[PDB]
Ligand binder design. Structure first.
Ligand SMILES: Nc1ncnc2c1ncn2[C@@H]1O[C@H](CSCC[C@H](N)C(=O)O)[C@@H](O)[C@H]1O
Ligand SMILES: [Zn+2]
Ligand SMILES: [Zn+2]
Length: 824
């Protein structure tokens, strides 16, 4: 508390409502703008309030005030209790307070990164600005005070202003008013400038197409079946991706008025509607083969609110292009094209109107060390983004290492445990026992890897031994690499639940470590499906950038994907964290289906083992054109599949081809197997108290536990076409949906695993039509691997390599964001 408060010196500036001072005397103690201060919280449980004094003034009401730019205590960030008690973080929170509330002046030191940062391997301090919505720690702003604002300079305030300014709609150029409306030639929002003739992204529900579309005649309940023949059919008891953006060319821009001035909150756009192929009568079955970025011109017009505009996109008439459709297309983000118009009325494709026509810096590649390199999915995505050149890779497992070499003739691959390699460099060795030159300080500019985080699954609290386990884990080793090499950029990829293992303590300790090193850092979850692959794959991503750099953003989703598979947010101690991703529903491109992925692949049989066979056909999908290339390439590699036992071979043959088919479609029949053995009939000799009798008067239990009792030891039945254990525990596991399931042509892969098993956790691994599990190549296609991408070892080795990889299209997306950080 402060009672004796008097100004010192001449006022710095006198506004109309405030008189500013540079110094004040509080209880005989000098205080200055720039000083830091503590304030005692009313809530005794909260950490002490801490602020920088950015300004001093008197209000007309006789109050002597300061502006408090608050600090954030470590425990109020993701770090929580892992954070240094003495570390503060900057935040965009500030306010006006009565000087008399100050409890004490405090010393707050700015711990700046040493000028020799690359070689580094009781007072409060700070180093980073904390963004609490995205969990980003970043370098403090470089912005300096001007003479004009030197008296009130507040980073927090300046930041909020810049946000507001960027966020808000503004009209750049007015044309004329017509009937209570100002028409404009140019506007802007969120940093994007939209002019007449530009194209725009809009939510699916922004407008409607004029084409008539008869509601799909669908089908009544499927054909009924005999429940003794199909005893598990009843357990089937009880097209979910949104649409991609609407797209339109801007024809006019007009807004209302307030006080004789433009109402910018009321800007409206009139657009020429564009048709995606699947928007025409062609629908989807008519667009399987079309480019994902091809559109159709239309003279249909729509009025839309600027507020709804989700972004800007380029749409060009094919013929006006100075380059090839392909070159133009792969040239930049948000690039579309058309070659025809579409008449909603005659359902015909005319030539585009005349008015639809036009008017008639090389970056250094980052030298990259890829730890836990695997077969190189991560390094491949980066290469594609053009941001890196992986010069060094470490992979303990020989086959994967070899695979890496096959794809990267130029990188020195150390097939070795990362722990012993690091010791070797610590040992001063220039070389490993094989003459291979170890990477040193300065060599490594970008460090990436996916450290297997094996233990830690039991999400109970961190104990003393647990902390030791972690200190000896591979994620820590990876951090050791970061600490020694001090790279410009750091990427740690992992399974989604990296963020939640042991109450998120794994996540918190690695962020704590990155912060301790002085790194900018953040984390997030991404869904590979949203970057152009036909698979559900949520992954964790920890990003870090060296003091002098920009911290990259997480890439905006490119493809629409099943919402249920796009739960990207993570809760840490009840706090919900999200990434900067803005596209929370729709997106530019349609979802990539199983069909796009592997409809061109020649037919193979269970156990097929010929690793080199010819494509006997052309790419059918856009996706297949990308992955197979335009280049001459006649050889289809690794189109081989596991050789399932005769029993399992039999089960597969008996899963029907209807979309969604799985083990519950299996007939309860005896089969003579391909060995001379027998798949027997499963027998039901217990009541399932929950499921009752069937229509054939049959019982439905295969164990005593189906009647509420304990399990009969004798219960288990062997060598039976319908796996015994599935009805056994079906009730407690949503009837094991998906097990022995066929992929749907219209659907997507379940998470691509190291060893696809019909009876594994996610067992929807059967080809949609053929009687076998998916091939190594097919799995590679479910990830984003080009067809030329090589793998190595026996079939299981290759599956392992493919299931382990980061899909290159996901990696590429991340790569481009880092690329943004390389400008200037
Ligand atoms: N101690 C260790 N040292 C080096 N590599 C290890 C290791 N322990 C496990 N690994 C390897 O780390 C890999 C993690 S899988 C990551 C693959 C890579 N990100 C990709 O996109 O392809 C596995 O292949 C595993 O063999
Ligand atoms: Zn402020
Ligand atoms: Zn039982």
């Amino acid at each position: 508390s402060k009672d004796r408060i008097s100004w010192l010196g001449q006022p710095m500036k006198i506004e109309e409502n405030r008189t500013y001072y540079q110094k004040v005397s509080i209880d005989e103690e000098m205080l200055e703008v720039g000083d830091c201060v503590s304030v005692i919280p009313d809530d005794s449980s909260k950490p002490l309030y801490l602020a920088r004094v950015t300004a001093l003034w008197e209000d007309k009401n006789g109050q002597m005030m300061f502006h408090a730019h608050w600090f954030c205590a470590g425990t109020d960030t993701v770090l929580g209790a892992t954070s240094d008690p003495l570390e503060l973080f900057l935040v965009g929170e500030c306010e006006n307070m009565q000087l008399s509330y100050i409890h004490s002046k405090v010393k707050v030191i700015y711990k700046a990164p040493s000028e020799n940062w690359a070689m580094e391997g009781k007072t409060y301090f700070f180093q980073l600005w904390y963004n609490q919505e995205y969990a980003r720690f970043e370098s403090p702003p470089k912005t300096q005070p001007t003479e004009d604002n030197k008296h009130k300079f507040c980073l927090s305030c300046i930041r909020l202003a810049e946000l507001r300014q960027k966020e808000m709609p503004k009209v750049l150029e007015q044309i004329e008013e017509v009937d209570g409306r100002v028409y404009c030639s140019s506007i802007t929002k969120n940093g994007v400038v939209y002019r007449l003739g530009d194209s725009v992204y809009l939510p699916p529900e922004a407008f409607t197409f004029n084409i008539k579309v008869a509601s799909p005649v669908k089908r009544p309940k499927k054909d009924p079946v005999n429940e003794t023949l199909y005893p598990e059919h009843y357990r089937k008891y009880s097209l979910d991706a949104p649409e991609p953006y609407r797209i339109g060319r801007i024809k006019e821009i007009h807004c209302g008025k307030k006080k004789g001035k433009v109402n910018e909150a009321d800007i409206k756009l009139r657009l020429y509607k564009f048709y995606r192929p699947e928007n025409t009568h062609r629908s989807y079955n008519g667009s399987y083969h079309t480019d994902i970025n091809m559109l159709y011109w239309s003279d249909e017009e729509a009025v839309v609110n600027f507020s709804d505009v989700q972004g800007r996109c380029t749409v060009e008439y094919g013929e006006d292009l100075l380059e090839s459709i392909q070159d133009y297309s792969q040239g930049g983000p948000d690039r579309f094209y058309f070659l025809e118009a579409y008449n909603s009325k005659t359902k015909n494709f005319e030539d585009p109107p005349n008015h639809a026509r036009s008017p008639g810096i090389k970056l250094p590649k980052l030298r990259t060390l890829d730890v836990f390199s695997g077969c190189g999915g991560l390094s491949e995505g980066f290469h594609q983004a053009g941001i890196s050149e992986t010069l060094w890779a470490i992979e303990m497992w020989d086959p994967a290492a070899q695979a890496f070499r096959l794809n990267n003739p130029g990188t020195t691959v150390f097939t070795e445990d990362c722990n012993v390699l690091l010791k070797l460099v610590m040992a001063g060795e220039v070389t490993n026992s094989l003459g291979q030159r170890l990477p040193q300080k300065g060599d490594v500019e970008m460090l990436c890897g996916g450290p297997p985080c094996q233990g830690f699954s039991g999400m109970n609290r961190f104990n003393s031994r647990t902390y030791s386990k972690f200190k000896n884990s591979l994620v820590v080793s990876f951090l050791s690499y970061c600490d020694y090499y001090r790279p410009r950029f750091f990427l740690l990829e992992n399974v989604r639940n990296f963020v939640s293992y042991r109450r998120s303590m794994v996540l918190k300790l690695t962020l704590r470590c990155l912060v301790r090193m002085g790194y900018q850092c953040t984390f997030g979850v991404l869904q590979a499906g949203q970057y152009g692959v036909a698979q559900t794959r949520r992954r964790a991503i920890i990003l870090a950038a060296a003091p002098g750099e920009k911290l990259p953003l997480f890439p905006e989703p490119l493809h629409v994907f099943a919402p249920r598979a796009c739960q990207l947010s993570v809760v840490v101690d009840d706090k919900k964290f999200v990434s900067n991703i803005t596209r929370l529903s729709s997106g530019p491109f349609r979802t990539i289906t199983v069909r796009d992925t592997m409809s061109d692949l020649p037919e193979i049989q269970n156990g097929a083992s010929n690793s080199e066979i010819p494509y006997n056909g052309e790419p059918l999908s856009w996706f297949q054109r990308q992955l197979r290339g335009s280049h001459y390439q006649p050889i289809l590699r690794d189109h081989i599949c596991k050789d399932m036992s005769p029993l399992v071979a039999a089960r597969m043959r008996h899963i029907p081809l209807f979309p969604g088919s799985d083990w519950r479609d299996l007939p309860n029949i005896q089969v003579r197997l391909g060995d001379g053995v027998i798949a027997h009939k499963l027998q039901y000799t217990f009541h399932d108290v929950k499921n009752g009798y069937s229509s054939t008067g049959a019982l439905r239990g295969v164990c005593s536990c189906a009647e509420g009792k304990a399990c009969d030891p004798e219960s288990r039945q062997f060598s039976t076409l319908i796996p015994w254990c599935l009805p056994h525990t079906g009730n407690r596991h949503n009837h094991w949906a998906g097990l022995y399931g066929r992929l749907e042509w219209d659907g997507f892969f379940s998470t691509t695993v190291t060893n696809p098993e019909p009876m594994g956790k996610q067992g929807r691994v059967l080809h949609p039509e053929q009687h076998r599990v998916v091939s190594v190549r097919e799995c590679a296609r479910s990830q984003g691997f080009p067809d030329s991408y090589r793998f190595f070892g026996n079939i299981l080795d290759r599956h392992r390599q493919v299931g382990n990889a980061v899909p290159p299209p996901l990696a590429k997306a991340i790569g481009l964001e880092i690329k943004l950080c390389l400008l200037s």
